[PDB]
Design an enzyme around this catalytic site. Structure first.
Site, PDB file in Angstrom:
ATOM      1  N   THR I  22      -0.647   9.279  -4.074  1.00 58.99           N
ATOM      2  CA  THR I  22      -1.784   8.775  -3.295  1.00 58.99           C
ATOM      3  C   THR I  22      -1.455   7.439  -2.606  1.00 58.99           C
ATOM      4  O   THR I  22      -0.330   7.266  -2.164  1.00 58.99           O
ATOM      5  CB  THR I  22      -2.996   8.778  -4.224  1.00 58.99           C
ATOM      6  OG1 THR I  22      -2.956   7.725  -5.149  1.00 58.99           O
ATOM      7  CG2 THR I  22      -3.171  10.078  -5.009  1.00 58.99           C
ATOM      8  N   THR I  23      -2.347   6.469  -2.428  1.00 58.86           N
ATOM      9  CA  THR I  23      -1.957   5.159  -1.885  1.00 58.86           C
ATOM     10  C   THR I  23      -2.782   3.966  -2.392  1.00 58.86           C
ATOM     11  O   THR I  23      -3.970   4.039  -2.715  1.00 58.86           O
ATOM     12  CB  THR I  23      -1.889   5.218  -0.364  1.00 58.86           C
ATOM     13  OG1 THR I  23      -1.055   4.212   0.119  1.00 58.86           O
ATOM     14  CG2 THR I  23      -3.231   5.021   0.317  1.00 58.86           C
TER      15      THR I  23
END
Lengths: 230, 180, 228, 176, 227, 228, 75, 243, 199
Positions: I22-23
């Site tokens: 993800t981030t």
């Protein structure tokens, strides 16, 4: 001379450690240990004092330095569970007492260590020989028994066992004779329910498994209300 | 039989866990329960290893293991094999014996706590059963309605060969095992 | 005291004083050096007239030599050690040990057993001889690890006569080079002077000789009839 | 080839050949290649005999059935595994069950009324799958061995020389 | 070493005899201590393998570890050769461990002496070996260890010739019970005996069978009184 | 391990005084072979041979005999056997006897000042380098070459006649009746194939130990020679 | 085979051996010998067959008195 | 002596290690129905020397505290090994800090491992360990040089131990809340004290219900954070106004 | 620890681990540091040192709680608060010891008696530092977002709005903010056969 002086003094050490009894039945085993004179502020259910549970199916009634005994008790647990993981099947009481009694000679073999100041009355069950009762001492010898004692006043306790013990009796008969013995070999002016520990082994709830209860201090009152005094 | 399905589902004071035909892959530890999809070697090695660890814990701590503590035990013990991780998807279950909370959790092979509290799916299959399970479920069932929908979820997860299943219902102070 | 590293109230080391008392028990040996060669004479011992007389000359790849003035096994530990110390120096490098470090290596290795708690020093006086990149050498070694390059010396019980003779005649050996002749005979007179009423014979007496273009050759064999 | 085949009947444990007694109520068989398939059988036989010296008693067929796979898994955890099948069976002189267990190359365990190994060994397994009876007699067990041998060299490419056959029962191990 | 052999001289009397095709070993055993159980009690005489036995006198604690060390060796020797360890090789190891634990300070010697015996496959000679804290192995055709072994050794050396081994297990057992009955004023329930016949026929004798030998010798002794 | 006021080890000397009350083993060399012999003492007539054999083979070329506890040296003898035969297995030769005698008596140095094998020892045998050779070995590190030598209570008293009564040209049978004459000298006893045991060590025999029957024809030969 | 095997098994002592090499080059022959002689009279004097943990004062000489390794939770 | 037995089965060296414990500056602890207290006297030297660096009382897990009598350096290494054990045997396998029973078993082992091993004297300290287990509750233990450990309702060790346990055997009864235990404990060290009685000659610390204000972050109601609190000299000087 | 190796290569010839792909972001601000992740990826090393993690999730939870054990023992062995550079040194030594074979990608952000700090560890034990970072696969958009809209000293509110934007670039977020005098702040999701028996 053919003697070991540290080891005779280690036997003199367990002779200071308070009296403990164990008696078999035609279907089960009992353990009964005295806690010596003790301060009012001691806890009474958290204190791991004389008796323990080494796997599903084996107990111990110890006299010694409890600190020494804790390491052997832990190694019996580790070995018993590693046996149960090895053979997928229960550890016999005799193999277990052999393994712990080796260690107690393996230190006695030596000058770099003191021997463990601990005697050990073991109760257990297996599908080798049924109920087994063993006794083991600071030099690392072991012996099977029907009725036995360790620690202080061992001899006076075995004089009370000698003539009274009848070979056929049930578990709940032995729960009498343990207290007849301990009260006659008492190290205190009198007993109270908090001064002793008991544990038992029986054939399941009925058949199949094994039942392996430790008495909490009310259950210890429940066996004292019986075979008590007036 | 070469790769199991375990399914897990939650309700008010109750949980269900389901399993293959033969050697049921739902193992149990008094009052925590462990489904394990995996190779039979690792599945029985984990039972051998957790029989050992859970008996040591049960003896040492003077209480049996609770579901959350078992979750972290299987996590750290799979991480103890981080370089050679067992081929498994454990699916732990139980009711926490102090609070009465339902608990279910899944894991990957290296012990991630896959905390998917709605329902939990584990196998080499999975894809069809995840679609069925989310569709057939509804929240906060009682034990029998919890049983009716998990048994429907398995009876639809059955590839069309028929062969049955085992369903545990795990509950506050009770457990039952149904050969479906 | 008898303790192997501990010091006496007067700063003394009774263990090493008694390692040197083994010089007051080992049978005599004597040695000397010149511009080009060096020599030692070993006098032997026996248990009975029958008994074969004791071996006390060795070599290190025909590059060095050694004798004993106490316990032969202890001198044999130093002998085998130095012989392998000269064996690895030869084969690993294609060089040779010039005798300079032989004295040092002994004096490191013998001090250590008075230094550490452990087994005692090598209980014996040793005389090492060799030939270098330049010149022949004699080293006396003494227990606890002293090396001295003595121009002549004698070791073992009552050896004060043979020292006195190598001192008393500084001619005949110091100046002698090319052929070995008078070195052997003069050293042999010094040991032969030392014996109170005892005897010299063709098996009983043996000579180590080393130097330029003599590959170290052991002389206890029947060729010694040339030098009695 | 060398399929190992074994069948249980109400009376006994029957093994057919790479086979061993371990102990007075245990047989085992070990189809698989040279070296470790054969050599591991010595360590189990030695240490189980060490137990039946050291106790005045014998382990069950269950005890050996698991202990063998603990050690097989253990011996391979720091290796690649190798082509092996271990079939254990014995007579439990507490329960009076004859018992049989199959351990595959990875160290599986499966308790069974019969076991097998090898490619055309599946023919035997399918014959047992047709024929088995809950409490088969010894003579029918020996006839099921006759029946699997009666197909095996017919379904095989050639006469691979059939079997040598052994029993565990209450009277101790017997050979035929 | 000297105090250590007094451990043996403090230990139970153990004894045996060769025969033309057997060895018999036995021990004075203190019966049972009123409340001890025989099935739950170790025998004194101890098997090492189906064709090999060890009996002893002295530290029984050290003797467990001495027999336990012998048991791992005897199996390891078998495993490593399929050579079911010959009695002379079993004796080498057990004598060797008593050498090993003599030689050092720390790990003080086993306070034990042994009779080791058995039959190699097809070796109908009864090999009997005796070992002590130093690690000797004197063989004997008959021998005594423990305490009170004066009158036992005197009575045996007056009743056996090394070139006279009785073939029959009857006389083999008969001699040894007479011998132990000089020491056991405590009565002949206290004795235990065991026999090796060749090819793994190690056999123990029961509490009834030794009595058909105590009440065979006893009336033989009364016939010697009436004679 | 410890030193005295006079140069010598107490852990060796206070051990070695035991063998001075040990079994009286005696050996003799000759032109034709070696003889080695012992008081065949037994703890009882019940003890079989092939147990505490007080004389043993090392290889077809070499034997041993000793005076203290044989089991101690029996450990050294395990290594003596294995080291000898492994030389032959690797290099296809019997290890030349003196090099075995050093290698087998070097065990009493293990690499320093060691606790003793409390037993003096008599290696003897054949090679083509120095012939039939009779040695002696110790809890120190020592040798002999070829003559008579003895160990145990009677030995140094016997040695006074062993030195007298010998010469190089003797044949073996001469040493056989000579080894019985000496072995009787202090035992208070009739020697026979029960109180004495013997061996002859030759190129024709190898090492071999006289059988009880051959010990009765050689004692008969000495007994009829008593009239000389 | 595994690229981290043996490398991690010997890391505990191998890093300590290399740390003694820095003690040599920065403080001469005295400090590594002083410490490795402390290591020998602290590790070899821990005679206790039932105790395999090692030694409590070893971390007082090893900087592990207040730190953890995976190797110390996974013995 | 190396802790080998004397002629009546006494360990010898341990009775002298108990005498090192017996000589120390007092500490005591009390189990109370809602919490546990640990209490000790400090000394240091002149007004030159602080009594306020690394404290005599210290935190082992967020829910367990410890205090001692005897040789300070021994105690200080026992607690800093004990902290390491709690993380490497419990927290990094189980995700939970070990209950009092297990961490006391581990301290007891280090002390027993000293009454038997080579080249080592016993540790000269008795450790009072006190803390909270969710399953068996608010708890107090004494661990002695011998390695043996006794659980208690209240206990005291060192110089003042005989008076302090004589007082606590006359006083303690199965109704005391945390605060009246502190008012007896203060009156108890008010009779251990050799110097002045004040809020820097006495250390005093508690386990009660948690303080999320001491978690140093918030947002995860789940976490309760610290069960154990080090009382400041101000928090102590308030209660020292009533005594 | 290495067990059960050399066998899995044959069994594979395998379940996938739960990698977080993800981030996540960290931004340094007027009075502290912000970090956030696009969710539970916000592990604690200590109450004031936080890690946003990425890659193999089990590695991130295991190592952060191991370093958090080292640092909890450390705070108890010194009687001082721990530092972001202490966590950065220990993750460098610790992830260097496990050679990127432990696979975690890991932000470290926090406040201590010296100040407010922001670092990241890549799998090789390699380190970066700055006034802002973004990690986990969405980050290439957050590069542009943070470089463009960050400025000297955003306060809490704008750093949380910038975090929202950065993670939004590359629908929900976890954020935690460490402010130099105060308890660190945690924010979650801010944006028909039958048989029976008793067993």
């Amino acid at each position: 001379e053919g003697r070991l002086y540290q080891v005779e003094y280690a036997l003199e050490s367990i002779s200071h450690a308070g009296t403990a009894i164990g008696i078999m039945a035609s279907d089960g085993i009992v353990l009964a240990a005295e806690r010596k004179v003790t301060s009012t502020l001691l806890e009474q259910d958290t204190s791991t004092e004389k008796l323990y549970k080494l796997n599903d199916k084996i107990a111990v009634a110890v006299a010694g330095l409890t600190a020494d005994a804790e390491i052997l008790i832990n190694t019996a647990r580790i070995h018993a569970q590693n046996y149960l993981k090895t053979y997928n099947e229960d550890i016999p009481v005799e193999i277990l007492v052999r393994r712990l009694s080796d260690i107690k000679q393996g230190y006695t073999q030596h000058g770099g260590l003191r021997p463990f100041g601990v005697s050990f009355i073991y109760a257990g069950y297996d599908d080798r020989y049924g109920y087994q009762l063993y006794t083991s001492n600071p030099s690392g010898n072991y012996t099977g028994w029907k009725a036995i004692s360790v620690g202080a006043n061992t001899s006076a306790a075995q004089t009370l066992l000698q003539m009274d013990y009848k070979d056929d009796m049930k578990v709940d008969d032995a729960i009498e004779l343990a207290l007849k013995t301990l009260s006659k070999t008492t190290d205190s002016s009198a007993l109270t329910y908090d001064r002793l520990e008991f544990a038992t082994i029986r054939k399941g709830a009925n058949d199949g498994e094994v039942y392996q209860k430790i008495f909490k201090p009310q259950e210890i009152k429940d066996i004292l209300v019986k075979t008590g005094i007036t | 039989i070469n790769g199991g399905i375990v399914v897990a589902m939650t309700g008010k004071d109750c949980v269900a866990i389901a399993c293959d035909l033969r050697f049921e892959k739902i193992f149990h530890y008094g009052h925590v329960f462990l489904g394990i999809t995996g190779l039979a070697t690792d599945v029985t090695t984990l039972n051998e290893m957790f029989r050992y660890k859970t008996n040591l814990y049960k003896l040492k701590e003077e209480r049996a293991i609770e579901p959350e503590t078992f979750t972290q035990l299987v996590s750290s013990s799979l991480y103890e094999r981080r370089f050679g991780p067992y081929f498994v998807g454990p699916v732990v279950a139980g009711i926490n014996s102090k609070s009465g909370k339902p608990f279910i959790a899944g894991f990957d092979l290296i012990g991630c706590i896959d905390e998917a509290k709605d329902f939990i799916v584990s196998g080499t299959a999975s894809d069809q059963l995840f679609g069925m399970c989310e569709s057939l479920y509804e929240p906060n069932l009682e034990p029998e309605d919890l049983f009716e929908t998990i048994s429907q979820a398995l009876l639809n997860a059955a590839d069309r060969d028929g062969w049955g299943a085992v369903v545990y219902i795990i509950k506050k102070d009770e457990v039952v095992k149904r050969y479906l | 005291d008898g303790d192997t590293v501990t010091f006496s109230p007067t700063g003394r080391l009774f263990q090493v004083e008694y390692a040197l008392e083994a010089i007051k028990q080992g049978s005599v040996t004597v040695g000397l050096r010149s511009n080009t060669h060096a020599v030692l004479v070993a006098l032997k011992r026996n248990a009975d007239e029958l008994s074969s007389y004791q071996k006390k000359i060795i070599k290190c790849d025909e590059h060095m030599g050694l004798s004993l003035a106490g316990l032969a096994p202890d001198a044999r530990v130093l002998s085998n050690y130095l012989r392998q110390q000269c064996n690895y120096s030869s084969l690993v490098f294609n060089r040779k040990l010039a005798v300079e470090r032989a004295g040092h290596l002994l004096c490191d290795k013998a001090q250590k057993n008075t230094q550490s708690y452990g087994g005692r020093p090598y209980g014996v006086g040793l005389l090492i001889i060799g030939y270098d990149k330049s010149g022949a050498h004699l080293l006396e070694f003494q227990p606890s690890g002293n090396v001295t390059e003595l121009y002549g010396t004698a070791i073992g019980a009552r050896s004060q006569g043979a020292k006195t003779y190598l001192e008393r005649t500084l001619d005949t050996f110091i100046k002698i080079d090319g052929n070995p002749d008078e070195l052997i005979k003069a050293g042999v007179e010094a040991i032969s002077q030392s014996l109170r009423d005892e005897s010299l014979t063709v098996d009983n007496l043996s000579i180590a000789i080393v130097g330029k273009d003599t590959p170290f050759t052991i002389y206890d064999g029947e060729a010694v009839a040339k030098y009695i | 080839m060398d399929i190992i085949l074994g069948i249980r009947v109400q009376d006994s444990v029957i093994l057919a050949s790479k086979t061993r007694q371990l102990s007075p109520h245990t047989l085992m068989s070990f189809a698989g290649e040279a070296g470790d398939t054969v050599q591991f059988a010595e360590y189990i036989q030695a240490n189980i005999q060490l137990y039946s010296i050291r106790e005045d008693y014998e382990l069950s067929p269950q005890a050996v059935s698991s202990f063998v796979r603990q050690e097989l898994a253990k011996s391979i955890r720091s290796r690649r595994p190798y082509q092996v099948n271990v079939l254990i069976g014995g007579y439990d002189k507490k329960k009076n069950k004859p018992e049989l267990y199959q351990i595959d190359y990875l160290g599986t365990k499966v308790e069974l009324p019969y076991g097998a190994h090898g490619y055309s060994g599946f023919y035997t397994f399918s014959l047992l799958d047709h024929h088995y009876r809950p409490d088969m007699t010894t003579e029918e067990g020996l006839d099921l061995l006759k029946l699997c041998v009666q197909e095996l060299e017919k379904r095989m490419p050639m006469d691979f020389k059939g079997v040598i056959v052994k029993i565990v029962d209450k009277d101790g191990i017997r050979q035929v | 070493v000297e105090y250590a052999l007094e451990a043996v001289k403090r230990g139970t009397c153990a004894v045996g005899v060769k025969g033309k095709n057997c060895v018999v070993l036995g021990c004075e055993r203190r019966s049972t201590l009123k409340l001890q159980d025989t099935r739950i009690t170790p025998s004194k005489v101890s098997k090492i393998d189906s064709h090999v036995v060890l009996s002893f006198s002295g530290l029984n604690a050290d003797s467990r570890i001495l027999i336990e060390k012998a048991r791992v060796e005897a199996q390891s020797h078998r495993l490593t050769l399929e050579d079911p360890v010959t009695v002379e090789y079993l004796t080498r190891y057990v004598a060797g461990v008593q050498q090993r634990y003599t030689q050092s300070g720390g790990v003080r010697p086993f306070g034990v002496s042994t009779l080791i015996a058995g039959f190699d496959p097809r070796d109908d000679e009864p090999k009997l070996y005796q070992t002590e804290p130093s690690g000797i192995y004197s063989s004997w055709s008959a021998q005594t260890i423990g305490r009170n072994s004066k009158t036992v050794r005197e009575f045996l050396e007056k009743n056996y010739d090394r070139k006279e081994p009785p073939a029959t297990v009857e006389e083999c057992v008969k001699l040894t019970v007479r011998s132990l009955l000089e020491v056991v004023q405590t009565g002949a329930k206290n004795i235990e005996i065991t026999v090796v016949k060749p090819d793994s026929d190690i056999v123990a004798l029961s509490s009834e069978e030794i009595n058909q030998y105590v009440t065979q010798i006893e009336q033989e002794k009364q016939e010697q009184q009436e004679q | 391990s410890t030193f005295s006021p006079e140069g010598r080890l107490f852990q060796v000397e206070y051990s070695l005084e035991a063998i001075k009350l040990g079994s009286t083993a005696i050996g003799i060399a000759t032109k034709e072979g070696v003889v080695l012999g012992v008081e065949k003492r037994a703890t009882s007539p019940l003890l079989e041979s092939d147990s505490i054999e007080k004389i043993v083979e090392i290889d077809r070329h070499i034997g041993c005999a000793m005076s203290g506890l044989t089991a101690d040296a029996r450990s050294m003898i395990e290594h003596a056997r294995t080291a000898a035969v492994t030389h032959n297995l690797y290099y296809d030769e019997d290890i030349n006897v003196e090099s075995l005698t050093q290698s087998v008596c070097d065990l009493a140095l293990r690499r320093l000042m060691s606790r003793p094998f409390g037993v003096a020892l008599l290696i003897a045998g054949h090679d083509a380098d120095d012939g039939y050779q009779l040695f002696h070995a110790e809890p120190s590190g020592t040798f002999y070459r070829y003559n008579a030598k003895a160990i145990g209570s009677g030995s140094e008293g016997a040695q006074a006649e062993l030195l007298n009564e010998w010469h190089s040209s003797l044949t073996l049978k001469e040493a056989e009746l000579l080894v019985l004459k000496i072995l009787k000298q202090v035992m208070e006893e009739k020697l026979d194939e029960n109180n004495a045991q013997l061996s002859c060590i030759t190129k024709q025999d190898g090492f071999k130990i006289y059988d009880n029957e051959k010990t009765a024809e050689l004692i008969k030969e000495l007994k009829e020679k008593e009239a000389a | 085979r595994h690229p981290l095997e043996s490398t991690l098994k010997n890391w505990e002592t191998t890093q300590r051996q290399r740390q003694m090499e820095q003690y040599r080059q920065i403080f001469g022959i005295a400090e590594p010998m002083k410490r490795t002689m402390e290591m020998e009279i602290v590790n070899r004097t821990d005679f206790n067959p039932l105790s395999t943990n090692g030694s409590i004062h070893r971390d007082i000489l090893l900087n592990k008195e207040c730190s953890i390794d995976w190797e110390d939770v996974y013995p | 002596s190396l802790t080998t037995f004397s002629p009546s089965g006494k360990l010898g060296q341990i009775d002298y290690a108990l005498t090192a414990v017996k000589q120390g500056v007092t500490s005591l602890g009390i189990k109370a129905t809602n919490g546990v207290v640990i209490a000790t006297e400090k000394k240091s030297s002149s007004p030159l020397a602080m009594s306020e660096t690394l404290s005599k009382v210290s935190l082992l897990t967020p829910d367990i505290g410890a205090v001692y009598s005897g040789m300070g350096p021994d105690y200080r290494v026992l607690v800093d090994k004990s902290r390491k054990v709690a993380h490497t045997s419990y927290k990094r396998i189980y995700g939970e800090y070990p209950p009092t029973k297990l961490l006391v078993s581990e301290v007891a082992k280090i002390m027993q491992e000293a009454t038997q091993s080579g080249g080592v004297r016993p540790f000269g300290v008795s450790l009072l360990i006190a803390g909270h287990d969710e399953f068996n509750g608010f708890s107090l233990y004494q661990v002695d040089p011998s390695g043996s450990y006794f659980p208690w309702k209240a206990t005291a060790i060192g110089k003042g131990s005989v008076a302090a346990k004589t007082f606590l055997e006359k006083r303690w009864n199965d109704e005391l809340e945390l605060e009246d235990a502190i008012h007896i404990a203060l009156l108890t060290l008010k009779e251990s004290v050799e110097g002045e009685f004040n809020g820097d000659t006495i250390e005093l610390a508690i386990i009660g219900d948690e303080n999320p204000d001491l978690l140093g972050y918030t947002g995860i109601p789940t976490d309760k954070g610290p069960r154990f609190r080090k009382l400041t000299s101000q928090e102590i000087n308030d209660r020292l106004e009533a005594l | 620890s290495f067990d059960n190796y050399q066998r899995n290569n044959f069994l594979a010839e395998q379940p996938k681990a739960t990698s977080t792909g993800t981030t996540i972001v960290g931004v340094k601000f007027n009075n502290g540091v912000v970090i956030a992740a696009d969710t539970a990826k916000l592990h604690r090393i200590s109450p004031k040192i936080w890690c946003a993690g990425a890659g193999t999730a089990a590695d991130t939870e295991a190592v952060t709680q191991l370093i958090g054990s080292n640092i909890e023992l450390h705070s108890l062995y010194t009687s001082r608060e721990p530092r972001v550079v202490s966590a950065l040194q220990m993750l460098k030594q610790h992830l260097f010891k496990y050679q990127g074979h432990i696979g975690a990608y890991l932000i470290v952000a926090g406040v201590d008696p010296t100040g407010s700090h922001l670092f990241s560890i890549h799998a090789h034990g390699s380190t970066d530092v700055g006034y802002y970072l973004s990690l986990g696969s969405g980050s290439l958009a957050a590069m542009a977002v943070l470089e463009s809209h960050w400025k000297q000293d955003l306060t809490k509110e704008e750093a949380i709005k910038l975090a929202s934007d950065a993670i939004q670039a590359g629908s929900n977020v976890d954020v935690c903010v460490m402010e130099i005098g105060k308890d660190a702040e945690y924010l979650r999701n801010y944006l028909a056969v039958l048989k029976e028996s008793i067993v």
